[PDB]
Ligand binder design. Structure first.
Ligand code: 8XQ
Ligand code: NI
Ligand code: ZN
Length: 347
């Protein structure tokens, strides 16, 4: 139902909003997932926190300086880790005259300045901060407890993986970036921008993901040779012009404060922050993900790589396939357009 696989936007009513799992099934039934990325504007009367005036003392244990290098729309991003700092001192830096958002009229203009000045004046990104900004009693779309089947991991093994089955906070300033990547184990993610300047996103349809990898391997032959999935290192930036020039289908969308972005299995995404802002994210799953999890190609070169045992999911949700899967003979091919089984009630 999304032939053009464009990025859809949904405005759920407070009743529709209440059950998270259920609503994800609904937007998949609308074809949202085909774009790789989808936006969800929450009911006006929804708020996850009363005031963000109390966080100035919150610690960012490991702010990152993002050094980018390259030319002609192809870049590699190197992380230089800085000393800890509080949200307050970070916001002074972000708003300071050297790190703050350039002046501009339309978005396209800011986008052009980003791709022009990307390798200059390296910003700091308050990334991967363990925490949440939700109030204990928020029962709608609480990133800390979404109740999806991804809960099986910690439930059956006690295993937690920071930012994956726990939430992460990201304090951005102008010109800070996330490189091109799909999620760990090719999961879904949910991103909520608590406050501040927009965050803009690019995405390639999962249907065309393989194209983007082909392109990437040609541009960084070295990295590709050394690691089966070097894009998972999250150091590879590629401008939209470069994508256009080589025929990769992609779409754009700007996320403003108070909106959600949902990433879908094997949806490659990237983007940048407009200025000082704050976001929370974690991963989650649906039944549709299980198969992606089984076939996710994982980083083969680094020790600190996330690898979830699919075993528990295969027994509980694909019992008839388990033996065949452990014998390495499960040849299921994935149809990236099919909606998740739970969406049948909406069809
Ligand atoms: O930092 C971000 O804005 C961001 C956005 C979307 C993602 O999928 C990310 N994944 C890993 C780290 C950061 C991000
Ligand atoms: Ni991510
Ligand atoms: Zn690797």
């Amino acid at each position: 139902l999304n032939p053009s696989a464009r990025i859809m936007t949904f405005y759920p009513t407070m009743e529709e909003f209440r059950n998270f799992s259920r609503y994800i099934a609904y937007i998949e039934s609308q074809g949202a997932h085909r774009a790789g990325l989808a936006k969800v504007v929450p009911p006006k009367e929804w708020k996850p926190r009363a005031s963000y005036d109390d966080i100035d003392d919150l610690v960012i244990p490991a702010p990152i300086q993002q050094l980018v290098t390259g030319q002609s729309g192809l870049f590699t991003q190197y992380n230089i880790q800085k000393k800890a700092m509080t949200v307050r001192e970070f916001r002074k830096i972000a708003n300071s005259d050297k790190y703050c958002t350039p002046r501009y009229s339309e978005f396209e203009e800011l986008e052009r300045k980003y791709w022009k000045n990307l390798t200059f004046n390296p910003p700091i990104y308050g990334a991967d901060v363990n925490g949440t900004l939700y109030e204990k009693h928020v029962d709608e779309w609480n990133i800390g407890r979404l109740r999806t089947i991804l809960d099986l991991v910690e439930k059956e093994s006690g295993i937690t993986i920071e930012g994956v089955n726990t939430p992460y906070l990201y304090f951005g300033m102008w010109k800070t970036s996330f490189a091109w990547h799909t999620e760990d184990m090719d999961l879904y993610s949910i991103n909520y921008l608590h406050f501040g300047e927009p965050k803009s996103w690019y995405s390639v349809p999962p249907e065309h993901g393989k194209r983007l990898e082909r392109l990437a391997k040609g541009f960084f032959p070295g990295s590709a040779q050394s690691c089966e999935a070097f894009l998972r290192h999250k150091m590879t930036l590629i401008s939209p012009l470069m994508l256009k020039k080589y025929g990769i289908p992609f779409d754009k969308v700007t996320q403003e404060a108070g909106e959600f972005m949902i990433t879908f299995p094997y949806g490659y995404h990237a983007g940048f922050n407009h200025g000082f802002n704050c976001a929370e994210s974690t991963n989650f799953a649906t039944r549709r993900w299980i198969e992606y999890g089984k076939q996710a190609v994982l980083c083969s070169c680094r020790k600190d790589m996330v690898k979830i045992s699919m075993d528990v999911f295969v027994r509980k949700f694909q019992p008839e396939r388990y033996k065949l899967w452990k014998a390495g003979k499960d040849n299921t091919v994935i149809d990236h357009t099919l909606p998740t089984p739970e969406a049948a009630e909406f069809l």
